[PDB]
Every structure is written in structure tokens, then in C-alpha cells.
Ligand binder design. Structure first.
Ligand SMILES: Nc1cccc2c1[nH]c(=O)n2C1CCN(C(=O)Nc2ccc(I)cc2)CC1
Ligand code: NI
Length: 316
């Protein structure tokens, strides 16, 4: 019934934020394996759900145009002031990425090369619950398959928001919905495989063993290492997933998620080998060392630097 907006179709319903193309490139951020809930439904127009609302986003060289759909039978309108703050906090636009790029570039000749082509790759500030279960789905997986699992999971367990064209939009489920006695069998049917068990188990564990979503907010204000250790107690959450969550939803910019992907980049592009550890391949000790290598090199925003390289390694 209702349709996806463009800036040509319905220009009245949009609103802008002053945002240069060097501070943010939507096409390099919204599909770089941070969030799996954004799609280019028409050229230059990314649509996705954030906090029980759908948005479409597009941009010029110096402005970020955005528009909101409220879903329930309401009078359609432009984004409000508070809704623009949500979007401003989502992209973390307070932090100057240009100054960070040059700071990382000053000690990293490799980054300097990559930073020519790949500007405006920033870290999203995601909801902790959405980020946790999305990255439980990420193990031994690719962006396409992960995007499917999360889409189907939200349709099955999450509250419906709105339909635009054929695409039906659902908010991320609360933890109680994922923790129920049928959730594993349903999630296995939806294609998650072994990951189905960890999704149910972690939902159940955060509720009973940690006391619901308030715990994740406690980890936002806890120090990096306390949070990482706490998350590692959850079913299907190891060092790499714990770090993905720390970096992307618990405001820990120094967190460097380490698995085979940065291993390849570290070795091929930095000549890195584990010195202190004996074994030449990946291991818990070696992965930890590689995280410290990048923090030591880039500084306390080391995770954001990693995203730039990842975003470059995904584009050919
Ligand atoms: N070649 C390559 C290189 C890096 C990621 C890749 C690939 N290929 C691929 O399918 N992915 C996925 C892998 C799992 N994943 C991910 O790790 N996202 C994530 C983690 C940390 C940060 I900083 C930023 C993104 C979701 C994206
Ligand atoms: Ni070598």
C-alpha cells in the first residue's frame, strides 16, 4: 500500500543534517558488516529500522538527508528534533573522523593509502541487544547469510512496524521473546543451524543470570575489560563477538575484534606474525596479541581504524 520514499518523489517529508562526505559515506558504512538491517532499496537511498521506527537515508556532498515512517496509522511528516538526535548519536557525529584519519595515518603508511579511497567510514552506535544476537549469527558466516538470518529472526519474533512495497519491517525482539521453550526449534527452521542454540541460551542467560537489558547498559559504563569478560560468559559469545559488541554498542573504541579476517590483513598488509606466542597460526593467546598490536599502533580508537580497513577489504 505505502511505498519507499526518494528525495525526488516526496521532498517535503525529508530533513537534513550538516554532514560532509568525508565524515560519512553511507554506502561504505551501512553495508560494511556492522549493522545487517540496511538495504539500498532504490539507488543512493538506504532504508532500515532503528528503535521501532523505519528510516530512509540519502546524502549529497555536504548534507545528510533523512526521513521517518512511524508505521501506525499516523499523519506522515518530517523527522522531529529528538529523532535527529537519535540519528546524530547513531553515527557518532560529535567525533571528528577527519582528525582521527590523519592521526592513524601519521603512524601507519598502509592506512594512509587506504584512507585516500575510503573516507567517511565510521562506527555506528548500535543497540546492545541487536548487536549481540546479530554477531552470534556472524560466526563462520557472510554478510548475505547473516542479513537473512537477522531479517527472518525479526519477522518471527519481533513486532511489526510497517510495510513499504513488498518489504515488511519488524523491530528487534526483546530478550523474553528469544528465550522461550520453542525458540531454538523455530530458529533452526529459519536457517541458523547450531547458532539457534546460542541465541536462545544467551537470551535466557541475560534474563536469569544477569537481570535483563539493564545489564547491557551497565556494561556501557563499565570499563572495556570488565565488559569483555562479562560478555564472554554467555553461550556462543567468545573474544571476537564480545569485542564486536564492545566496539559497536558498549562505547569501547579501543576494542579490536580478532579472527581470521584481521589475521589476513595483519599478516599480508603489516607483515605481522605472533612473536611472543610459539604457534604460527591463530590461537586465543595469539589473537589477544594481535588486538594489542593494533591498539598500540593506532591508539584508543583502534576499533574504528579497523572498520576502515574492513570496509576497504569488503570492496574488492
Ligand atoms: N573479507 C572480510 C573482511 C572483514 C569482514 C568480513 C569479510 N567477509 C565477510 O563476509 N565479513 C563479515 C564477517 C563477519 N562480520 C564482521 O566481522 N563484521 C565486523 C567486525 C568488526 C568490525 I571493526 C567491522 C565489521 C560481518 C562481516
Ligand atoms: Ni609471513
Amino acid at each position: 500500500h505505502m511505498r519507499h520514499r526518494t528525495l525526488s518523489s516526496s521532498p517535503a517529508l525529508w530533513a537534513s543534517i550538516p554532514c560532509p562526505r568525508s565524515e560519512l559515506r553511507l554506502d561504505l558504512v551501512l553495508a560494511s558488516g556492522q549493522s545487517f538491517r540496511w538495504k539500498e532499496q532504490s539507488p543512493a537511498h538506504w532504508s532500515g529500522v532503528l528503535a521501532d521506527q523505519v528510516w530512509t537515508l540519502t546524502q549529497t556532498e555536504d548534507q545528510l538527508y533523512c526521513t521517518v515512517y512511524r508505521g501506525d496509522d499516523s499523519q506522515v511528516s518530517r523527522p522531529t528534533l529528538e529523532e535527529l538526535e537519535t540519528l546524530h548519536k547513531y553515527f557518532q557525529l560529535d567525533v571528528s573522523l577527519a582528525q582521527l584519519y590523519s592521526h592513524w595515518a601519521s603512524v601507519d603508511s598502509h592506512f594512509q593509502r587506504v584512507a585516500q579511497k575510503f573516507q567517511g567510514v565510521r562506527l555506528l552506535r548500535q543497540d546492545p541487544t541487536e548487536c549481540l544476537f546479530s554477531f552470534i549469527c556472524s560466526s563462520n558466516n557472510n554478510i548475505a547469510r547473516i542479513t537473512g538470518m537477522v531479517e527472518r529472526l525479526c519477522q518471527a519474533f519481533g513486532p511489526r512496524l510497517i510495510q513499504l512495497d513488498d518489504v515488511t519491517y519488524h523491530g528487534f525482539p526483546n530478550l523474553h521473546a528469544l528465550a522461550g521453550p520453542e525458540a531454538e526449534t523455530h530458529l533452526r527452521k529459519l536457517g541458523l543451524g547450531y547458532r539457534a542454540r546460542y541465541v536462545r541460551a544467551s537470551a535466557k542467560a541475560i534474563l536469569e543470570e544477569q537481570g535483563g537489558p539493564a545489564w547491557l547498559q551497565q556494561l556501557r559504563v563499565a570499563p572495556y575489560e570488565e565488559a569483555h569478560k562479562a560478555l564472554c560468559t554467555l553461550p556462543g559469545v567468545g573474544a571476537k563477538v564480545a569485542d564486536c559488541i564492545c566496539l559497536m554498542a558498549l562505547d569501547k573504541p579501543q576494542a579490536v575484534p580478532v579472527d581470521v579476517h584481521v589475521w589476513q590483513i595483519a599478516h599480508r598488509d603489516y607483515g605481522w606474525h605472533p612473536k611472543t606466542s610459539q604457534a604460527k597460526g591463530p590461537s586465543p593467546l595469539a589473537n589477544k596479541e594481535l588486538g594489542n598490536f593494533f591498539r598500540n599502533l593506532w591508539g584508543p580508537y583502534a576499533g574504528w581504524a579497523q572498520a576502515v580497513l574492513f570496509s576497504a577489504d569488503l570492496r574488492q
